CSV table of C-alpha atoms in Angstrom, one decimal:
chain,number,residue,atom,x,y,z
A,1,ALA,CA,-4.5,-20.3,1.0
A,2,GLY,CA,-5.6,-18.8,-2.3
A,3,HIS,CA,-5.7,-15.1,-3.2
A,4,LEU,CA,-7.2,-12.7,-5.8
A,5,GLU,CA,-5.1,-10.8,-8.3
A,6,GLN,CA,-6.0,-7.5,-10.0
A,7,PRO,CA,-3.0,-6.8,-12.4
A,8,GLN,CA,-4.3,-3.4,-13.4
A,9,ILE,CA,-2.9,-1.1,-10.8
A,10,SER,CA,-5.0,1.5,-12.5
A,11,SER,CA,-7.0,1.9,-15.7
A,12,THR,CA,-7.0,5.3,-17.3
A,13,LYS,CA,-9.8,6.1,-19.7
A,14,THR,CA,-11.2,9.2,-21.3
A,15,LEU,CA,-14.9,10.1,-21.0
A,16,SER,CA,-17.6,8.1,-22.7
A,17,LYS,CA,-15.2,5.2,-23.2
A,18,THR,CA,-15.7,1.8,-21.7
A,19,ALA,CA,-13.4,0.2,-19.0
A,20,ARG,CA,-12.8,-3.5,-18.3
A,21,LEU,CA,-11.3,-4.3,-14.9
A,22,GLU,CA,-10.1,-7.9,-14.4
A,23,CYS,CA,-9.8,-10.2,-11.3
A,24,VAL,CA,-8.0,-13.5,-11.5
A,25,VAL,CA,-8.5,-15.8,-8.6
A,26,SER,CA,-5.9,-18.4,-7.8
A,27,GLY,CA,-5.6,-21.1,-5.1
A,28,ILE,CA,-9.4,-20.8,-4.5
A,29,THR,CA,-12.1,-22.9,-6.2
A,30,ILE,CA,-14.2,-20.5,-8.2
A,31,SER,CA,-17.2,-22.8,-9.1
A,32,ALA,CA,-19.1,-22.9,-5.8
A,33,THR,CA,-19.1,-19.3,-4.4
A,34,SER,CA,-19.7,-16.0,-6.1
A,35,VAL,CA,-17.2,-13.3,-7.2
A,36,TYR,CA,-18.1,-9.9,-5.7
A,37,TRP,CA,-17.1,-6.4,-6.9
A,38,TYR,CA,-16.8,-3.4,-4.5
A,39,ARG,CA,-16.5,0.3,-5.4
A,40,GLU,CA,-14.7,2.8,-3.3
A,41,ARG,CA,-15.6,6.3,-4.5
A,42,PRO,CA,-13.2,9.1,-3.4
A,43,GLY,CA,-14.2,10.4,0.0
A,44,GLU,CA,-16.8,7.5,0.3
A,45,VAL,CA,-16.8,4.2,2.1
A,46,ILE,CA,-16.1,0.9,0.3
A,47,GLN,CA,-19.5,-0.3,-1.0
A,48,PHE,CA,-21.0,-3.3,-2.8
A,49,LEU,CA,-21.4,-2.9,-6.5
A,50,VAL,CA,-22.3,-6.1,-8.3
A,51,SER,CA,-21.7,-9.8,-8.0
A,52,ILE,CA,-22.0,-12.9,-10.2
A,53,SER,CA,-23.0,-16.2,-8.6
A,54,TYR,CA,-22.0,-19.7,-9.8
A,55,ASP,CA,-25.2,-20.4,-11.6
A,56,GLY,CA,-24.8,-17.2,-13.6
A,57,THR,CA,-27.2,-14.8,-12.0
A,58,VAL,CA,-26.0,-11.3,-11.3
A,59,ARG,CA,-27.1,-8.9,-8.6
A,60,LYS,CA,-26.3,-5.2,-8.4
A,61,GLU,CA,-26.5,-2.9,-5.4
A,62,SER,CA,-29.6,-0.8,-4.8
A,63,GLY,CA,-29.6,2.3,-7.0
A,64,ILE,CA,-27.2,1.0,-9.6
A,65,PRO,CA,-28.5,2.5,-12.9
A,66,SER,CA,-29.4,0.4,-16.0
A,67,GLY,CA,-26.9,-0.8,-18.5
A,68,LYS,CA,-23.9,0.6,-16.6
A,69,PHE,CA,-22.1,-2.4,-15.3
A,70,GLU,CA,-21.4,-5.9,-16.4
A,71,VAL,CA,-19.9,-9.0,-14.8
A,72,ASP,CA,-18.7,-12.3,-15.9
A,73,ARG,CA,-16.7,-15.3,-14.7
A,74,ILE,CA,-14.7,-17.4,-17.1
A,75,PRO,CA,-13.7,-20.4,-14.9
A,76,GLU,CA,-11.3,-21.9,-17.4
A,77,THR,CA,-9.0,-19.0,-17.0
A,78,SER,CA,-10.0,-18.3,-13.4
A,79,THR,CA,-11.0,-14.7,-14.0
A,80,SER,CA,-13.9,-12.3,-13.5
A,81,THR,CA,-14.3,-9.0,-15.4
A,82,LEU,CA,-16.1,-5.9,-14.3
A,83,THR,CA,-17.1,-3.8,-17.4
A,84,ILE,CA,-18.0,-0.2,-17.0
A,85,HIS,CA,-19.8,1.3,-19.9
A,86,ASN,CA,-19.9,5.0,-20.8
A,87,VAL,CA,-17.3,5.8,-18.1
A,88,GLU,CA,-17.6,9.2,-16.5
A,89,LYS,CA,-16.1,11.4,-13.8
A,90,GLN,CA,-18.3,10.0,-11.1
A,91,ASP,CA,-16.9,6.6,-12.0
A,92,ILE,CA,-13.5,7.5,-10.7
A,93,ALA,CA,-12.9,5.2,-7.7
A,94,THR,CA,-11.1,2.2,-6.6
A,95,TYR,CA,-12.7,-1.1,-7.7
A,96,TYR,CA,-12.1,-4.2,-5.6
A,97,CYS,CA,-13.0,-7.8,-6.3
A,98,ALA,CA,-13.6,-10.2,-3.4
A,99,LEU,CA,-14.9,-13.7,-2.6
A,100,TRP,CA,-15.6,-16.0,0.3
A,101,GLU,CA,-12.8,-18.5,0.9
A,102,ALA,CA,-13.6,-21.7,2.6
A,103,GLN,CA,-11.4,-22.7,5.5
A,104,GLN,CA,-12.1,-26.0,7.2
A,105,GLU,CA,-15.8,-26.4,8.0
A,106,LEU,CA,-19.1,-24.6,7.6
A,107,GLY,CA,-19.2,-21.6,9.9
A,108,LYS,CA,-15.5,-20.8,9.2
A,109,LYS,CA,-15.3,-18.6,6.1
A,110,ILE,CA,-13.2,-15.6,5.3
A,111,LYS,CA,-13.8,-12.9,2.7
A,112,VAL,CA,-10.8,-12.4,0.6
A,113,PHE,CA,-10.2,-9.1,-1.3
A,114,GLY,CA,-8.1,-8.3,-4.4
A,115,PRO,CA,-5.7,-5.3,-4.2
A,116,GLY,CA,-8.0,-3.1,-6.1
A,117,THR,CA,-7.7,-1.2,-9.4
A,118,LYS,CA,-8.0,2.5,-9.6
A,119,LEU,CA,-10.1,3.9,-12.5
A,120,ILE,CA,-8.7,7.2,-13.7
A,121,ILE,CA,-10.8,9.4,-16.0
A,122,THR,CA,-9.1,12.2,-17.9
A,123,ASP,CA,-10.4,14.6,-20.6
A,124,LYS,CA,-7.8,14.1,-23.4
A,125,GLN,CA,-5.7,11.2,-24.6
A,126,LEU,CA,-2.1,11.3,-23.6
A,127,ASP,CA,0.5,11.4,-26.4
A,128,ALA,CA,3.9,11.0,-24.8
A,129,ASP,CA,5.9,8.3,-23.0
A,130,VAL,CA,4.7,8.1,-19.5
A,131,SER,CA,6.4,4.9,-18.2
A,132,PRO,CA,8.4,5.3,-15.0
A,133,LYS,CA,12.0,6.1,-15.9
A,134,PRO,CA,14.4,4.2,-13.5
A,135,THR,CA,17.7,5.3,-11.9
A,136,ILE,CA,20.1,3.0,-10.1
A,137,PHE,CA,21.8,4.0,-6.9
A,138,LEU,CA,24.5,1.7,-5.4
A,139,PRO,CA,25.4,1.9,-1.7
A,140,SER,CA,28.2,4.3,-0.6
A,141,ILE,CA,31.4,2.5,0.0
A,142,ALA,CA,31.6,4.0,3.5
A,143,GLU,CA,28.3,2.5,4.5
A,144,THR,CA,29.5,-1.0,3.9
A,145,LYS,CA,31.8,-0.4,6.9
A,146,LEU,CA,28.9,0.8,9.0
A,147,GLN,CA,26.6,-2.1,10.0
A,148,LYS,CA,28.6,-3.8,7.2
A,149,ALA,CA,25.4,-3.3,5.2
A,150,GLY,CA,24.4,-1.7,1.9
A,151,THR,CA,21.5,0.5,0.8
A,152,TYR,CA,20.1,0.4,-2.7
A,153,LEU,CA,17.8,3.2,-4.0
A,154,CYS,CA,15.8,3.1,-7.2
A,155,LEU,CA,14.4,6.4,-8.4
A,156,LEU,CA,11.3,6.4,-10.7
A,157,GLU,CA,10.3,9.7,-12.4
A,158,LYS,CA,8.2,11.2,-15.2
A,159,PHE,CA,5.4,8.6,-15.0
A,160,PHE,CA,1.8,9.7,-15.2
A,161,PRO,CA,-1.1,7.9,-13.5
A,162,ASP,CA,0.9,8.4,-10.3
A,163,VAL,CA,-0.7,5.2,-9.1
A,164,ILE,CA,2.5,3.1,-8.7
A,165,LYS,CA,3.8,0.1,-6.7
A,166,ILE,CA,7.4,-0.7,-5.9
A,167,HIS,CA,8.9,-3.7,-4.1
A,168,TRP,CA,12.2,-5.6,-4.0
A,169,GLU,CA,13.5,-9.1,-4.4
A,170,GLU,CA,16.4,-11.5,-4.4
A,171,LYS,CA,17.3,-12.1,-8.1
A,172,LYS,CA,16.9,-15.8,-7.9
A,173,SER,CA,14.9,-16.6,-4.8
A,174,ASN,CA,12.1,-14.1,-5.6
A,175,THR,CA,10.4,-13.5,-2.3
A,176,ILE,CA,9.4,-9.9,-1.3
A,177,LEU,CA,11.5,-8.3,1.4
A,178,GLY,CA,11.0,-5.3,3.7
A,179,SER,CA,11.9,-2.0,2.2
A,180,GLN,CA,10.8,1.6,2.6
A,181,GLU,CA,9.8,4.4,0.2
A,182,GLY,CA,9.1,8.1,0.2
A,183,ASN,CA,5.8,9.7,-0.8
A,184,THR,CA,5.0,10.0,-4.5
A,185,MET,CA,5.7,13.5,-5.7
A,186,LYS,CA,4.1,15.5,-8.4
A,187,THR,CA,6.4,17.2,-10.9
A,188,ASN,CA,4.5,19.3,-13.5
A,189,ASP,CA,1.7,16.9,-14.5
A,190,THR,CA,4.0,13.9,-14.1
A,191,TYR,CA,5.2,12.2,-10.9
A,192,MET,CA,8.3,10.6,-9.2
A,193,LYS,CA,8.9,8.3,-6.3
A,194,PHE,CA,11.8,6.4,-4.8
A,195,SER,CA,12.3,3.2,-2.9
A,196,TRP,CA,15.4,2.1,-0.9
A,197,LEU,CA,16.5,-1.1,0.7
A,198,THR,CA,19.3,-1.8,3.2
A,199,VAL,CA,20.7,-5.3,2.6
A,200,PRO,CA,22.4,-7.0,5.6
A,201,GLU,CA,26.1,-8.2,5.7
A,202,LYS,CA,25.1,-11.6,4.2
A,203,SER,CA,23.2,-10.6,1.0
A,204,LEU,CA,25.9,-8.2,-0.2
A,205,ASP,CA,27.1,-10.9,-2.8
A,206,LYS,CA,23.6,-11.7,-4.1
A,207,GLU,CA,21.8,-9.8,-6.9
A,208,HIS,CA,18.7,-7.7,-6.2
A,209,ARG,CA,15.8,-6.4,-8.2
A,210,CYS,CA,13.6,-3.2,-8.0
A,211,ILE,CA,10.2,-4.3,-9.5
A,212,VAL,CA,7.9,-1.5,-10.7
A,213,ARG,CA,4.2,-2.1,-11.4
A,214,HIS,CA,2.7,0.7,-13.3
A,215,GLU,CA,-0.2,1.2,-15.8
A,216,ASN,CA,2.1,2.4,-18.4
A,217,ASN,CA,5.3,0.4,-18.2
A,218,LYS,CA,6.6,-0.6,-21.6
A,219,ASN,CA,4.6,-3.6,-23.0
A,220,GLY,CA,2.2,-3.4,-20.1
A,221,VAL,CA,4.2,-5.6,-17.8
A,222,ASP,CA,6.0,-5.1,-14.5
A,223,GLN,CA,9.4,-3.3,-15.0
A,224,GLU,CA,12.2,-5.3,-13.5
A,225,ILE,CA,15.1,-3.1,-12.5
A,226,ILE,CA,18.4,-5.0,-12.1
A,227,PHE,CA,20.6,-4.1,-9.2
A,228,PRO,CA,24.2,-5.4,-9.4
A,229,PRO,CA,25.7,-7.4,-6.5
A,230,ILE,CA,28.8,-6.0,-4.8
B,1,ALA,CA,-30.1,2.5,7.4
B,2,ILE,CA,-27.2,0.6,8.9
B,3,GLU,CA,-23.8,2.3,9.2
B,4,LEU,CA,-20.4,1.8,10.8
B,5,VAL,CA,-18.5,4.8,12.1
B,6,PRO,CA,-14.9,4.7,13.4
B,7,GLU,CA,-14.1,6.4,16.6
B,8,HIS,CA,-11.3,8.6,15.2
B,9,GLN,CA,-10.3,9.3,11.6
B,10,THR,CA,-6.6,9.3,12.6
B,11,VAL,CA,-5.1,7.4,15.6
B,12,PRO,CA,-1.4,8.0,16.2
B,13,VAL,CA,0.5,5.2,18.0
B,14,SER,CA,4.0,4.6,19.3
B,15,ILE,CA,6.1,1.5,18.6
B,16,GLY,CA,5.7,-1.2,21.2
B,17,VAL,CA,2.9,0.8,22.9
B,18,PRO,CA,-0.5,-1.0,22.9
B,19,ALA,CA,-3.3,0.9,21.1
B,20,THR,CA,-6.9,0.1,20.4
B,21,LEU,CA,-9.1,0.9,17.4
B,22,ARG,CA,-12.9,1.1,17.9
B,23,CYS,CA,-15.8,1.4,15.5
B,24,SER,CA,-19.5,1.8,16.4
B,25,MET,CA,-22.5,0.6,14.5
B,26,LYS,CA,-25.4,3.2,14.2
B,27,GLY,CA,-28.2,1.2,12.7
B,28,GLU,CA,-29.2,-2.1,14.4
B,29,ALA,CA,-27.8,-4.5,17.1
B,30,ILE,CA,-24.1,-5.4,16.8
B,31,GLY,CA,-25.1,-9.0,17.6
B,32,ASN,CA,-27.1,-9.7,14.4
B,33,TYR,CA,-23.9,-9.0,12.5
B,34,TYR,CA,-20.5,-10.6,12.2
B,35,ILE,CA,-17.8,-8.0,12.5
B,36,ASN,CA,-14.6,-8.1,10.4
B,37,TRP,CA,-11.4,-6.0,10.4
B,38,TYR,CA,-9.3,-5.3,7.3
B,39,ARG,CA,-6.4,-3.0,6.8
B,40,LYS,CA,-4.4,-1.3,4.1
B,41,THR,CA,-0.6,-0.8,4.7
B,42,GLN,CA,2.2,0.0,2.3
B,43,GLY,CA,2.9,-3.0,0.1
B,44,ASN,CA,0.0,-5.2,1.3
B,45,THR,CA,-3.4,-3.8,0.4
B,46,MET,CA,-6.8,-4.7,1.9
B,47,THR,CA,-5.7,-7.6,4.0
B,48,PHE,CA,-8.0,-9.6,6.3
B,49,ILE,CA,-7.3,-9.2,10.0
B,50,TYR,CA,-10.2,-10.5,12.1
B,51,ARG,CA,-13.6,-12.0,11.8
B,52,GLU,CA,-16.1,-12.5,14.7
B,53,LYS,CA,-14.9,-14.9,17.3
B,54,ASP,CA,-11.2,-15.8,17.2
B,55,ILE,CA,-10.8,-15.8,13.4
B,56,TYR,CA,-7.4,-14.3,12.4
B,57,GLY,CA,-5.5,-14.0,9.2
B,58,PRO,CA,-2.0,-15.5,8.9
B,59,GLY,CA,0.2,-13.7,11.4
B,60,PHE,CA,-2.4,-11.5,13.0
B,61,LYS,CA,-3.3,-13.5,16.1
B,62,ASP,CA,0.0,-12.8,17.8
B,63,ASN,CA,0.0,-9.0,17.4
B,64,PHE,CA,-3.7,-8.2,17.2
B,65,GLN,CA,-6.8,-9.0,19.2
B,66,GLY,CA,-10.4,-8.5,18.1
B,67,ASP,CA,-13.4,-8.2,20.3
B,68,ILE,CA,-17.0,-6.8,20.5
B,69,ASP,CA,-18.5,-4.6,23.2
B,70,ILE,CA,-22.2,-5.6,22.8
B,71,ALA,CA,-22.9,-3.2,25.6
B,72,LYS,CA,-22.8,-0.3,23.1
B,73,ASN,CA,-22.6,-2.1,19.7
B,74,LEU,CA,-18.9,-1.4,19.4
B,75,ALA,CA,-16.4,-3.3,17.3
B,76,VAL,CA,-12.9,-3.2,18.8
B,77,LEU,CA,-9.5,-4.3,17.6
B,78,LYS,CA,-6.5,-3.9,19.9
B,79,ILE,CA,-3.0,-3.6,18.5
B,80,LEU,CA,-0.7,-5.0,21.2
B,81,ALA,CA,2.8,-4.3,19.8
B,82,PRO,CA,2.7,-1.6,17.0
B,83,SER,CA,5.5,-1.6,14.5
B,84,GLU,CA,6.3,0.1,11.2
B,85,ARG,CA,4.4,-2.6,9.4
B,86,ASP,CA,1.2,-1.7,11.2
B,87,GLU,CA,0.9,1.9,9.8
B,88,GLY,CA,-2.0,2.2,7.4
B,89,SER,CA,-5.7,2.4,7.3
B,90,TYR,CA,-8.0,0.0,9.3
B,91,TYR,CA,-11.5,-0.8,8.2
B,92,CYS,CA,-14.4,-2.4,10.0
B,93,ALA,CA,-17.0,-4.3,8.1
B,94,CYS,CA,-20.1,-6.3,9.2
B,95,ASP,CA,-22.6,-8.6,7.6
B,96,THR,CA,-25.8,-10.6,8.2
B,97,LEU,CA,-26.0,-14.2,9.5
B,98,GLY,CA,-28.3,-16.6,7.6
B,99,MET,CA,-31.4,-14.6,6.7
B,100,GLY,CA,-34.6,-16.4,5.7
B,101,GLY,CA,-34.3,-16.0,1.9
B,102,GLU,CA,-31.8,-15.4,-0.9
B,103,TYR,CA,-29.9,-12.8,1.2
B,104,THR,CA,-26.6,-11.3,0.0
B,105,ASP,CA,-23.3,-12.2,1.7
B,106,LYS,CA,-22.1,-8.6,1.1
B,107,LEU,CA,-20.2,-6.7,3.7
B,108,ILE,CA,-21.0,-3.2,4.8
B,109,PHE,CA,-17.9,-1.0,5.5
B,110,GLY,CA,-17.2,1.9,7.7
B,111,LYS,CA,-14.9,4.8,6.7
B,112,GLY,CA,-11.3,3.9,7.5
B,113,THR,CA,-9.3,5.1,10.5
B,114,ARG,CA,-5.6,5.8,9.6
B,115,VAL,CA,-3.0,4.8,12.2
B,116,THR,CA,0.4,6.4,12.1
B,117,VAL,CA,3.4,4.8,13.8
B,118,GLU,CA,6.2,6.9,15.3
B,119,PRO,CA,9.2,5.7,17.4
B,120,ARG,CA,8.7,5.6,21.2
B,121,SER,CA,10.2,8.3,23.5
B,122,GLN,CA,13.9,7.3,23.8
B,123,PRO,CA,17.3,8.8,24.2
B,124,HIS,CA,18.7,10.9,21.4
B,125,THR,CA,21.1,9.6,18.7
B,126,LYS,CA,23.5,11.4,16.5
B,127,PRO,CA,23.0,10.0,12.9
B,128,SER,CA,25.4,8.6,10.3
B,129,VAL,CA,25.4,10.3,6.9
B,130,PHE,CA,26.2,8.7,3.6
B,131,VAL,CA,25.7,9.8,0.0
B,132,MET,CA,25.2,7.7,-3.2
B,133,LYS,CA,25.2,9.1,-6.7
B,134,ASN,CA,24.5,8.5,-10.4
B,135,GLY,CA,25.2,11.4,-12.8
B,136,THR,CA,23.8,14.6,-11.4
B,137,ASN,CA,21.7,12.4,-9.2
B,138,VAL,CA,22.8,12.6,-5.6
B,139,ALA,CA,21.0,11.1,-2.6
B,140,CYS,CA,21.7,11.7,1.0
B,141,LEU,CA,21.2,8.8,3.4
B,142,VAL,CA,20.8,9.6,7.1
B,143,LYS,CA,20.9,6.5,9.3
B,144,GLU,CA,19.7,5.9,12.9
B,145,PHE,CA,18.8,9.2,14.6
B,146,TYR,CA,16.3,10.6,17.1
B,147,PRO,CA,14.3,12.8,17.5
B,148,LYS,CA,12.4,13.4,14.3
B,149,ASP,CA,13.3,17.0,13.7
B,150,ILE,CA,16.2,17.2,11.3
B,151,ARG,CA,17.5,19.3,8.4
B,152,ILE,CA,19.2,17.7,5.4
B,153,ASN,CA,21.6,19.6,3.1
B,154,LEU,CA,23.2,18.5,-0.1
B,155,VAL,CA,26.1,20.9,-0.4
B,156,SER,CA,26.2,22.1,-3.9
B,157,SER,CA,27.2,25.2,-5.9
B,158,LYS,CA,25.0,24.4,-9.0
B,159,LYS,CA,21.8,22.5,-8.2
B,160,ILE,CA,19.1,21.5,-10.7
B,161,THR,CA,16.3,20.4,-8.4
B,162,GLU,CA,15.7,19.0,-5.0
B,163,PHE,CA,12.9,16.7,-3.8
B,164,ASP,CA,11.1,16.4,-0.5
B,165,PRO,CA,13.0,14.2,1.9
B,166,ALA,CA,11.5,11.1,3.6
B,167,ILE,CA,11.7,10.3,7.3
B,168,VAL,CA,11.1,6.7,8.1
B,169,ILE,CA,11.2,4.5,11.2
B,170,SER,CA,14.3,2.3,11.4
B,171,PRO,CA,14.6,-1.4,12.3
B,172,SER,CA,16.1,-0.2,15.6
B,173,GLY,CA,12.9,1.7,16.2
B,174,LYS,CA,14.6,5.0,15.5
B,175,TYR,CA,14.7,7.0,12.2
B,176,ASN,CA,16.3,7.0,8.8
B,177,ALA,CA,15.9,9.5,6.0
B,178,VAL,CA,16.7,10.1,2.4
B,179,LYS,CA,16.8,13.2,0.3
B,180,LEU,CA,17.3,13.3,-3.5
B,181,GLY,CA,18.4,16.1,-5.8
B,182,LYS,CA,19.8,16.7,-9.2
B,183,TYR,CA,23.1,18.6,-9.3
B,184,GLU,CA,25.6,19.8,-12.0
B,185,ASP,CA,28.7,19.4,-9.8
B,186,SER,CA,27.3,16.1,-8.5
B,187,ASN,CA,30.8,14.5,-8.4
B,188,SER,CA,31.8,16.9,-5.6
B,189,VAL,CA,28.5,17.2,-3.8
B,190,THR,CA,28.4,16.1,-0.2
B,191,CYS,CA,25.7,15.9,2.5
B,192,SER,CA,25.6,17.8,5.8
B,193,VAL,CA,22.9,17.3,8.4
B,194,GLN,CA,21.7,19.4,11.3
B,195,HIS,CA,20.4,17.3,14.1
B,196,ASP,CA,19.9,17.7,17.9
B,197,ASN,CA,21.9,21.0,17.6
B,198,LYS,CA,24.8,19.0,16.1
B,199,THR,CA,26.2,19.0,12.6
B,200,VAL,CA,27.1,15.7,10.9
B,201,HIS,CA,28.9,15.5,7.5
B,202,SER,CA,29.0,12.8,4.9
B,203,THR,CA,32.8,13.5,5.0
B,204,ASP,CA,32.9,12.7,8.7
B,205,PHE,CA,33.0,9.1,7.5
B,206,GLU,CA,35.6,9.1,4.8
């Protein structure tokens, strides 16, 4: 029923700095079972990193060096935070948080994972606007006489981390649909990506939104791109 | 010590055509561990699919079927009716079952196996071609065509830049495609496609 959220699509940090990746659980009762943290190094397999129980003890995988990682779990604000000190290149990987969700009885448990956060480590600080720049594309008149449908297309370019997420929604009734996108393309140390959606005869009158989740959107929040009706 | 290894790194599949994913354990006995299957697809990341003995995630029991071949410590997941939504990476993970101490309920993963979905062998289809714009920004939209091989051209005298096109599976189990570019004479730009030895124009629909 519940699920884990990891808002940070990615966290970019420069060497020696310290990263803090969050996990907010919702719909699942925190106090009882422990919050786990998995690390997926590039090329490697997903592996256990650390975990914090309900009592407060914390176990780390075999080999994890001293004073590198830290975990906590504020139950009031239903969130756990993995802290990575003196970040370095070998820390580049995708970090996942997960926990065991009870179902009905004992002997019926499922391990739920968060979407993951990608830790990106660069050499120098970036000084320029890197937020994805949007571009609206309304269907071609002609198409509306095809399957009497319409196909929207939002183009996002000049964004940096490259780790991006695009999905669509009905303006009012905001429930994810079923669109398609092309591969993210590099364009001189910056990237672009596009997503398109073909709305059926019915929905032509409604309004639609292209929602972009990116580490560097303005204000640090999802970018909501408004697509006129018609 | 204990390790899970997928049968193949990549496993291509065709829509509607049953395919199975396997993953062997090379450490102990598959029985002393509960096997789980997770997957990563566009949109939905690291979703739960199956856990030892009939446990399925919402909407996975209908299309998927997990099972174990204790014979040779194999973990299997059969995809009955592949679709676009099933393209992604699939991961097998195991874990212990009530050890005599303060054991860790941590899972051990295997490297993922990527499955790619392509339409099933069908009869050819001439595509439709439309083009939408927005100041120098022109995008060609090729709808419903088969086979995959196609060439997309945005007719233009003065062109700024052109991006790699995208071929995708359509709801009809065929193909759709989009190609974006930046053009000075964007207002006049049109799209022409070469497919199945034919030539379709954006203007063939105006």
